[PDB]
Amino acid sequence: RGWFDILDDWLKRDRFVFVGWSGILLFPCAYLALGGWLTGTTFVTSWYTHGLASSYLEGCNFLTVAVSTPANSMGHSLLLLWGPEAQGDFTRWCQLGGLWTFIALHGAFGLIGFMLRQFEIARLVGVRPYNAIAFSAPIAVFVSVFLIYPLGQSSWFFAPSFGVAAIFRFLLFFQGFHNWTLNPFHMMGVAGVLGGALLCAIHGATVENTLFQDGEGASTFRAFNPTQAEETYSMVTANRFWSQIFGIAFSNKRWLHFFMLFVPVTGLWMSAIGVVGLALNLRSYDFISQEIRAAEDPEFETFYTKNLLLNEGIRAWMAPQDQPHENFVFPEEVLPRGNAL
Amino acid sequence: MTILFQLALAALVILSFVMVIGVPVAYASPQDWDRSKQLIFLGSGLWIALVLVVGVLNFFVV
Amino acid sequence: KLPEAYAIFDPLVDVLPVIPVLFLALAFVWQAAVGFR
Amino acid sequence: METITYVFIFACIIALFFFAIFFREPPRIT
Amino acid sequence: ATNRDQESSGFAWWAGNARLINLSGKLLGAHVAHAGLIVFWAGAMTLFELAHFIPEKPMYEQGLILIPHIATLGWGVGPGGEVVDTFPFFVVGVVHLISSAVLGFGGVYHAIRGPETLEEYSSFFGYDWKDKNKMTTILGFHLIVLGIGALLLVAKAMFFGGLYDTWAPGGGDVRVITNPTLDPRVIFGYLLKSPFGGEGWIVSVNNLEDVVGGHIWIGLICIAGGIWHILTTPFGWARRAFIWSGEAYLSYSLGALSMMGFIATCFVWFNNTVYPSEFYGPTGPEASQAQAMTFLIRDQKLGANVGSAQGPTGLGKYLMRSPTGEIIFGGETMRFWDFRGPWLEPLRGPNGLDLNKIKNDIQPWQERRAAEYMTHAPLGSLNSVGGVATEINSVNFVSPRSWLATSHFVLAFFFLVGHLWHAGRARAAAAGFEKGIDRESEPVLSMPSLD
Amino acid sequence: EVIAQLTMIAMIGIAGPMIIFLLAVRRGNL
Amino acid sequence: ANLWERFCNWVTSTDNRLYVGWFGVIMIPTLLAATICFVIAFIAAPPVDIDGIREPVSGSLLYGNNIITGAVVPSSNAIGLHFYPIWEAASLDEWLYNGGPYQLIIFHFLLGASCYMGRQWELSYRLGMRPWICVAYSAPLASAFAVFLIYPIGQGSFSDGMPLGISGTFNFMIVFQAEHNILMHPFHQLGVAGVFGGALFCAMHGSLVTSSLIRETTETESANYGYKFGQEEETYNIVAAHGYFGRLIFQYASFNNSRSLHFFLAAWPVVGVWFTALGISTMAFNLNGFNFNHSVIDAKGNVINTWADIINRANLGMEVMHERNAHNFPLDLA
Amino acid sequence: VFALLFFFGHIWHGARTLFRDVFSGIDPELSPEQVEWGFYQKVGDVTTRR
Amino acid sequence: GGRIPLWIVATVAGMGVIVIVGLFFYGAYAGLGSSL
Amino acid sequence: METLKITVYIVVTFFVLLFVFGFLSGDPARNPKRKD
Numbered sequence A: 001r002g003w004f005d006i007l008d009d010w011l012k013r014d015r016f017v018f019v020g021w022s023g024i025l026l027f028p029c030a031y032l033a034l035g036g037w038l039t040g041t042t043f044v045t046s047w048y049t050h051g052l053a054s055s056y057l058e059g060c061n062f063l064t065v066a067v068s069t070p071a072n073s074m075g076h077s078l079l080l081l082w083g084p085e086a087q088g089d090f091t092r093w094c095q096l097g098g099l100w101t102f103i104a105l106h107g108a109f110g111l112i113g114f115m116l117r118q119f120e121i122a123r124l125v126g127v128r129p130y131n132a133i134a135f136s137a138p139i140a141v142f143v144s145v146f147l148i149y150p151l152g153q154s155s156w157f158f159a160p161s162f163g164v165a166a167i168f169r170f171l172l173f174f175q176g177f178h179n180w181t182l183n184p185f186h187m188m189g190v191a192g193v194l195g196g197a198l199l200c201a202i203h204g205a206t207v208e209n210t211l212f213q214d215g216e217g218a219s220t221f222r223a224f225n226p227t228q229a230e231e232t233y234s235m236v237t238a239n240r241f242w243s244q245i246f247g248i249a250f251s252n253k254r255w256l257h258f259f260m261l262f263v264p265v266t267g268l269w270m271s272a273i274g275v276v277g278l279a280l281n282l283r284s285y286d287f288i289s290q291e292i293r294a295a296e297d298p299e300f301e302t303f304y305t306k307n308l309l310l311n312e313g314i315r316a317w318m319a320p321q322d323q324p325h326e327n328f329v330f331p332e333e334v335l336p337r338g339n340a341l
Numbered sequence B: 001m002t003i004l005f006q007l008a009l010a011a012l013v014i015l016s017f018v019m020v021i022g023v024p025v026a027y028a029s030p031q032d033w034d035r036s037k038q039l040i041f042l043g044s045g046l047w048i049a050l051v052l053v054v055g056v057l058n059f060f061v062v
Numbered sequence C: 001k002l003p004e005a006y007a008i009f010d011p012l013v014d015v016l017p018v019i020p021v022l023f024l025a026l027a028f029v030w031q032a033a034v035g036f037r
Numbered sequence D: 001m002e003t004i005t006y007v008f009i010f011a012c013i014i015a016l017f018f019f020a021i022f023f024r025e026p027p028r029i030t
Numbered sequence E: 001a002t003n004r005d006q007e008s009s010g011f012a013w014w015a016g017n018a019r020l021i022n023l024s025g026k027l028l029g030a031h032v033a034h035a036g037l038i039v040f041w042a043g044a045m046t047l048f049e050l051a052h053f054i055p056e057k058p059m060y061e062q063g064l065i066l067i068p069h070i071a072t073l074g075w076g077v078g079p080g081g082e083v084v085d086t087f088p089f090f091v092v093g094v095v096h097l098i099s100s101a102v103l104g105f106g107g108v109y110h111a112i113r114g115p116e117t118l119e120e121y122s123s124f125f126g127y128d129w130k131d132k133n134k135m136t137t138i139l140g141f142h143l144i145v146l147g148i149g150a151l152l153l154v155a156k157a158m159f160f161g162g163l164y165d166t167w168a169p170g171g172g173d174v175r176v177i178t179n180p181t182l183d184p185r186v187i188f189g190y191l192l193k194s195p196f197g198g199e200g201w202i203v204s205v206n207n208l209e210d211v212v213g214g215h216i217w218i219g220l221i222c223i224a225g226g227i228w229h230i231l232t233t234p235f236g237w238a239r240r241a242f243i244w245s246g247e248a249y250l251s252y253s254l255g256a257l258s259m260m261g262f263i264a265t266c267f268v269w270f271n272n273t274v275y276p277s278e279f280y281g282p283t284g285p286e287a288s289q290a291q292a293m294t295f296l297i298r299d300q301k302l303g304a305n306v307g308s309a310q311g312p313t314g315l316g317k318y319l320m321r322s323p324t325g326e327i328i329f330g331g332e333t334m335r336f337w338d339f340r341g342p343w344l345e346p347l348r349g350p351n352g353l354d355l356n357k358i359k360n361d362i363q364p365w366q367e368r369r370a371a372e373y374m375t376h377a378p379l380g381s382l383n384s385v386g387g388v389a390t391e392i393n394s395v396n397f398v399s400p401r402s403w404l405a406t407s408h409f410v411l412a413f414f415f416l417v418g419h420l421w422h423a424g425r426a427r428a429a430a431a432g433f434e435k436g437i438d439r440e441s442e443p444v445l446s447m448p449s450l451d
Numbered sequence F: 001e002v003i004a005q006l007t008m009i010a011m012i013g014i015a016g017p018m019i020i021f022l023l024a025v026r027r028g029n030l
Numbered sequence G: 001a002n003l004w005e006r007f008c009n010w011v012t013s014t015d016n017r018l019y020v021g022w023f024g025v026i027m028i029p030t031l032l033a034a035t036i037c038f039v040i041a042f043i044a045a046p047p048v049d050i051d052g053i054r055e056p057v058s059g060s061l062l063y064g065n066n067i068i069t070g071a072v073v074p075s076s077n078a079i080g081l082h083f084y085p086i087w088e089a090a091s092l093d094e095w096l097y098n099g100g101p102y103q104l105i106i107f108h109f110l111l112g113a114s115c116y117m118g119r120q121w122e123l124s125y126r127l128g129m130r131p132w133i134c135v136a137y138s139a140p141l142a143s144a145f146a147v148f149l150i151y152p153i154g155q156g157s158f159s160d161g162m163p164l165g166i167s168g169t170f171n172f173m174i175v176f177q178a179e180h181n182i183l184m185h186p187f188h189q190l191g192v193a194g195v196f197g198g199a200l201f202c203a204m205h206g207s208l209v210t211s212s213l214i215r216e217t218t219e220t221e222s223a224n225y226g227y228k229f230g231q232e233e234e235t236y237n238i239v240a241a242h243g244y245f246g247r248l249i250f251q252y253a254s255f256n257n258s259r260s261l262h263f264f265l266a267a268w269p270v271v272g273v274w275f276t277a278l279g280i281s282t283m284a285f286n287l288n289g290f291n292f293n294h295s296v297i298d299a300k301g302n303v304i305n306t307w308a309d310i311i312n313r314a315n316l317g318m319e320v321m322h323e324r325n326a327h328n329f330p331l332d333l334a
Numbered sequence H: 001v002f003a004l005l006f007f008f009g010h011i012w013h014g015a016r017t018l019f020r021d022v023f024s025g026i027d028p029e030l031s032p033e034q035v036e037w038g039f040y041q042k043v044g045d046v047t048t049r050r
Numbered sequence I: 001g002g003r004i005p006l007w008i009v010a011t012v013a014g015m016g017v018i019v020i021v022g023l024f025f026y027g028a029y030a031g032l033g034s035s036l
Numbered sequence J: 001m002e003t004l005k006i007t008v009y010i011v012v013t014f015f016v017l018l019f020v021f022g023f024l025s026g027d028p029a030r031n032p033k034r035k036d
């Protein structure tokens, strides 16, 4: 009975909130990403890095607060509180963007912690760790979007900032500069997210509407005993319903629930891959053949060309304020504009 | 009678407030079904009368 | 505005429209009182 | 050539639907 | 413990009102108490609007939806829709609020203290949902009440002051209606109109004679149908077609209300006769047409020959032809050429807008209305920033037409869901499998394999 | 003022809970 | 029996490989018409003057599109909301120029899909099932009504309905954002909670059932072969899954009622998609997203931009460029 | 892209190494005592009962 | 230990949250962030 | 064009009458449990 074994005993005591060894990574880093976001949206500005107000203290609301990314001029600095930018000055760290890397790095380690926790608890209880495996897709999104994407660009300035309206701006930036909707990796991701919502809804509705009558009550929730041996709904009737409604139907309960893991998990992975390409400006921006025809044939128009006109308006109308460090000065006469508007 | 109007009308308001609470409480205690079935009557009569009072006095102040 | 006769009740008038939704909340106070039987 | 390709692939999918419905492995209650 | 818990009623707390299905007296209470809430809100809300009302401001800058309904019936308003006496608004307000208390009282009496079930107290008031005869009788009585109410509108229009008539000569005014339309070729012609562009089904009704006449027909139809159902019981084809149960009746009505919610949505969005723009603001089409007029007027004043001005696309800048030839306003507003309104029709001749009238007869009051309406187009944000989505904060305005259309679409949609919910449930309950599939007798197990 | 409006709704608002409260004390018929 | 009753038993028969039903009697023709027209149009329709300004957009593969850029193009703004059947055209050529196929497809399709919802109810009643699958389909169906019908009603033209095309869908989204700030609209935010949450809970429930499969097979066979269609016993230990998932969060954040769990799975995405459907349907009447443009100002009254103002800068780039030849007057009011 | 995919390979074969015993499924005679709360002072360790 | 009934702490907690959020919505029209 | 219009009115009408009469032909009784 060494000290390591006694510490293992206590970390894996059955308690309201399980700790484990993974907890030594998870709880400090989760709490600090959380605490840091809350602190920064309550109290901290983006005035020196973005020219923006970003806290309740400045009179932002929940939609418009953010912990904003650091100034372009920091590059990919780790922005340590003791590092050469902030020199240990807490106040000036907040003002240069330190909380963004503070959250982004603690959050990345908290995510590692959470997955390790899934493995840890799964091993202790005796179950296969497919929940851990599925959680790989959130990790891949978070790592490609918040770390890889800016690392291929000039600086952390172009990562997402942590706020509601800040993320919308991200969204729209990606449309106007990257044409991200046209990217087949994002399409695949869309299909896996919508498809996963589809599956979620259709599975829950199917089961709720093929319950066996296992109690006399009009509320059907009390007629389920978790220890019971028997399926609580009819697979057989469900399969006939969908075979006749939709033409095919699941017959295998295990395949069905594996399919449910697979769809949304694979979708997020695919979109991750597309974003890695966008780190490099490796976009699916154009269709060359369309551009060659369009340029020679002023009467050739498609929805693809219409959307690019939109992209061009987004870029010109949003760049000076969105990328202030560039000092873009666009006289009115160069702003792209249709008639009247 | 600008002060007699506001008298009636605050009486009316006060008596609405007393009955908003009293009428449902009275109704759900069977210990005083008969202690209080006269009070809802008196209250109800009182109430309708004030509405009438305030309805005629309105036309001498408004 | 209300007729000057009624002006003093302006702030009571200002709050009365929200009263129907308190009925809805009040059913939840009620059911919690009876333990959601 | 590209129009033919798109329609070809679309047409293979519709035929797949037909086989997948009417020539599925019948689910048997075993 | 008469129902009132899950064990005895078979229903959980979150389905608690379903414990009332066969407790006619407590149910009567729940309905009357609820009627009290409706009538309370009509009272409290009107008084609130009056307290907040500034007569110098247009009603539509003030977030009012009920006062505009009263003014439409000709109370409180004069020429142009100007407010001339607020006392009637106060009256409508107070009388509903007082009335709400008597309803309240009778609701809580019946819900808490009255008989839980009415059928042993009284055979006229008690009812079994499966009594097809009692159900058409009650249906019959409420039909009669509704017929009476349609005729109270007629009374108001012919015998007690008339109605506000945005189309009245000289910019609109309260007007007594003396020759309602009884020709059923007009009245039911409205019902057979296509609901599509340029027709608009019953939403196209654009004069108060048609409005008052249709409500004479509805009054009598409802009165006649009421008698019919009081004196009859349902025929065999109807007995076999319907589910006869409380929930089924509920679901039929939810279907109906949902249909009506969507119609009202479109009424307040398109119709500028019974929702006068003086009171509710311009319609979306009206505002869009009003902008083309405004810049027509501006430019023509500067010297522009607006009939011959070719725009960038080759279509006319200010005027073009609709697909059937009518002269209409150009620009994107080409889609709204079906619009009609009292500020615009004076410029209309047999081929659409008349260029001679445009060149010679635009009055300053039309220029004013057109500028008023362009700047009160019904666009705005959920926090009532008026304008297009990109406008800066400044103008605190969302059109009551937006508020009334959006709210009633949301309700109509959810009431459709309610319909499907209770319709499907009432079907399965009546056949007896709403609580689940019976394991000993699973129908599908008795059916041949599909393949 | 606003203090007026708030005292009305404070009073109106405690009205409902107080009924439930009285009927529980008086062991009434909730 | 009689001929009518022979037909009636066939229509409503539970023995047909695809169930027909009375809703099916309407669904099948309208869906077939919609599908056939859509396929021919996507491949071969000539260009459509969507915006009514004699500027035809080319949508079909034969006129220079691929799978991504191609579309059936919405009908002309000149038509607005007018009904434009084939027989109102003077020629098919006219009908093609003005976007007639869009109307035909969407009307037959909305009608077919509504009957698809009712047909889900119908067969559930013949099979002895509970009735509410159709209520779940009502969420996507309602979303289709929003983009094909309701939004064009409120704006006065099917030309502003959603194009039947991959890129045309994106055109629609971008311009919606310009004109309504849908990102700032809480009903759309609820749509995202609904669909992100739906996928989250989809992965979750799959991963947790899959993690707690009872050993019924060797390492060389698919584990799927341990479930046999129609088997009476369950193939996973929900008690084990609750014990995993209760400990991962806490005990009471975890379901152990399967019925409660699967109802949550139903409700979350269906409610969320209802809200986003309603979001499109109320922005149809120009009740738009929160507008916080120039909402923060300093003590002098300089505007202190927030992230909302940066969004507005992008919205204005969409606004001034969309339908660039179509506005002659300075406000884009519909 | 390959580094990121290979991360998934790492998690996959990592999990199979450490969970080889239950890869085909969990124990068909698992006890409710090991997974329900409170019964063992230490999770998944039966020697700690009560 | 267990004396104050649950329904009462809920109501009080509930009114308390209503007030704090009501205040936040008030502030959206007053002072900072009101656009005025 | 007139001939296509007539043909479609007849087709649509035929199918709508099927739908209506079909559901009037005792549809509630066509379920696996209770024939009312």
Ligand code: CLA
Pocket: E136, E139, E143, E188, E191, E192, E221, E222, E223, E224, E225, E226, E228, E229, E232, E233, E234, E235, E238, J020
């Ligand atoms: C709230 C109003 C209301 C309600 C709920 C009912 C309910 C009922 N009525 Mg009553 N009815 C009413 C008002 C109402 N009625 C009024 C005001 C009148 C006066 C005209 C009548 C006259 C009347 C008669 C004469 C009869 C009924 C019958 C019935 C029963 C069957 C209805 C039916 O099959 O649905 C309608 C379902 C159908 C399948 C009919 C065809 C529907 C098609 C598809 C729609 C289009 C036709 C439509 C009827 C009108 C077209 C208008 C057009 C110009 C647009 C049912 C109990 C029947 C009964 O059993 O008598 C006791 C009966 O014979 N009612």
Ligand code: CLA
Pocket: A024, A025, A026, A028, A029, A032, A078, A079, A080, A081, A082, A098, A101, A102, A103, A105, A106, A109
């Ligand atoms: C699970 C715990 C955990 C983890 C992973 C992190 C991780 C991090 N923190 Mg956070 N932090 C934590 C807890 C944690 N913190 C806590 C509890 C607080 C509050 C006190 C903070 C407060 C905080 C601040 C204020 C900041 C960080 C920062 C950082 C980053 C840089 C850390 C660094 O440079 O360390 C360097 C130090 C080490 C790696 C530790 C040295 C380890 C050993 C002992 C070295 C010697 C080895 C020896 C030779 C052999 C020994 C063998 C053995 C048998 C004895 C990184 C993302 C910075 C950041 O986010 O900036 C953007 C930053 O400014 N942290």
Ligand code: CLA
Pocket: B019, B020, B021, B023, B024, B028, C024, C027, C028, C030, C031, E002, E003, E004, E005, E012, E013, E014, E015, E016, E017, E018, E019, E020, E023, E026, E027, E029, E030, E031, E033, E034, E101, E102, E104, E105, E108, E111, E112, F019, F020, F023, F029, F030
């Ligand atoms: C319009 C709203 C509305 C209405 C009218 C009703 C009405 C009713 N409900 Mg339903 N209910 C509702 C909403 C509503 N409910 C909601 C939202 C829920 C979900 C929480 C429920 C959940 C629910 C359950 C779980 C049950 C009911 C039951 C009942 C019935 C008996 C209640 C009882 O015994 O009270 C007992 C309560 C009291 C005595 C407390 C006080 C009650 C009164 C009404 C206070 C109102 C005071 C008010 C200011 C009046 C004074 C003004 C006057 C001077 C004019 C009653 C007919 C019960 C039933 O079916 O009985 C068999 C039942 O078991 N309801």
Ligand code: CLA
Pocket: E028, E032, E102, E103, E105, E106, E107, E109, E110, E114, E115, E118, E121, E122, E125
């Ligand atoms: C839908 C409405 C409705 C219905 C159907 C009933 C039905 C009933 N009530 Mg209830 N009640 C209601 C509303 C309703 N009440 C309201 C609003 C109140 C508040 C005052 C009450 C207060 C109340 C009490 C206090 C009592 C009843 C009792 C009764 C029973 C016998 C009443 C009787 O025969 O009077 C006979 C009535 C008449 C012969 C006609 C006079 C009634 C009024 C004045 C007629 C007005 C007609 C008017 C034009 C209708 C439109 C009004 C408005 C909406 C436009 C019966 C089951 C009694 C009971 O069951 O006790 C055991 C009882 O004691 N009710």
Ligand SMILES: CC1=C(/C=C/C(C)=C/C=C/C(C)=C/C=C/C=C(C)/C=C/C=C(C)/C=C/C2=C(C)CCCC2(C)C)C(C)(C)CCC1
Pocket: A031, A032, A034, A035, A036, A037, A038, A039, I017, I021
């Ligand atoms: C960062 C940092 C740090 C840390 C910090 C911390 C740890 C923090 C924490 C913090 C926290 C921890 C906070 C919290 C906050 C909270 C809040 C702010 C909340 C709010 C809430 C709300 C407002 C909600 C409400 C609601 C709604 C809205 C609806 C429903 C109902 C309810 C009630 C739920 C240190 C020191 C290291 C230093 C460095 C930096």
Ligand SMILES: CC1=C(/C=C/C(C)=C/C=C/C(C)=C/C=C/C=C(C)/C=C/C=C(C)/C=C/C2=C(C)CCCC2(C)C)C(C)(C)CCC1
Pocket: B012, B013, B016, B020, B054, C006, C009, C012, C013, C023, C024, C026, C027, C030, E029, E030, E033, E034, E036, E037, E040, E094, E097, E098, E100, E101, E103, E104, E105, E107, E108, E111
């Ligand atoms: C059953 C029930 C329920 C419900 C309830 C209800 C809904 C009730 C109703 C109630 C009602 C419905 C009530 C009413 C009331 C009313 C009142 C009480 C009134 C009064 C008035 C007055 C007194 C006036 C005065 C004035 C004038 C005259 C002028 C101006 C100013 C003023 C406003 C001051 C609940 C859910 C809770 C629960 C369960 C049971």
Ligand SMILES: CC1=C(/C=C/C(C)=C/C=C/C(C)=C/C=C/C=C(C)/C=C/C=C(C)/C=C/C2=C(C)CCCC2(C)C)C(C)(C)CCC1
Pocket: E186, E187, E188, E190, E191, E202, E205, E210, E211, E214, E215, E217, E218, E241, J019, J020, J021, J023, J024
């Ligand atoms: C006032 C007015 C007017 C008039 C109105 C009218 C004259 C109305 C009529 C109305 C009507 C006359 C309506 C009707 C209704 C109908 C309905 C809405 C129906 C429905 C039905 C159902 C729902 C059925 C179902 C079914 C089937 C189909 C099969 C078998 C089974 C069942 C039964 C389920 C006008 C516009 C001139 C102007 C303004 C004002």
Ligand SMILES: CC1=C(/C=C/C(C)=C/C=C/C(C)=C/C=C/C=C(C)/C=C/C=C(C)/C=C/C2=C(C)CCCC2(C)C)C(C)(C)CCC1
Pocket: B013, B016, B017, B020, C012, C016, C019, C022, C023, C025, C026, C028, C029, C030, C032, F012, F013, F014, F015, F016, F017, I007, I010, I011, I012, I013, I014, I015
């Ligand atoms: C007209 C008038 C009147 C009347 C009034 C009335 C009629 C009132 C009522 C009132 C009411 C009717 C109120 C109520 C209240 C309520 C409340 C305030 C509640 C709340 C709630 C809560 C807070 C909740 C919570 C909870 C629970 C309990 C459980 C679950 C969870 C939760 C958290 C949700 C008077 C006399 C003034 C005079 C003047 C005029």
Ligand code: OEX
Pocket: E332, G051, G077, G155, G159, G160, G175, G179, G322, G323, G326, G332, G333, G334
């Ligand atoms: O078409 Mn399609 O989009 Ca609704 O706003 Mn006006 O219009 Mn046109 O511009 Mn922007």
Ligand SMILES: [Cl-]
Pocket: A306, G171, G175, G321, G322, G323, G324
């Ligand atoms: Cl565009």
Ligand SMILES: [Cl-]
Pocket: E330, E331, E332, E333, G326, G327, G328, G329
């Ligand atoms: Cl224009």
Ligand SMILES: [Fe+2]
Pocket: A203, A257, G205, G209, G262
């Ligand atoms: Fe499941």
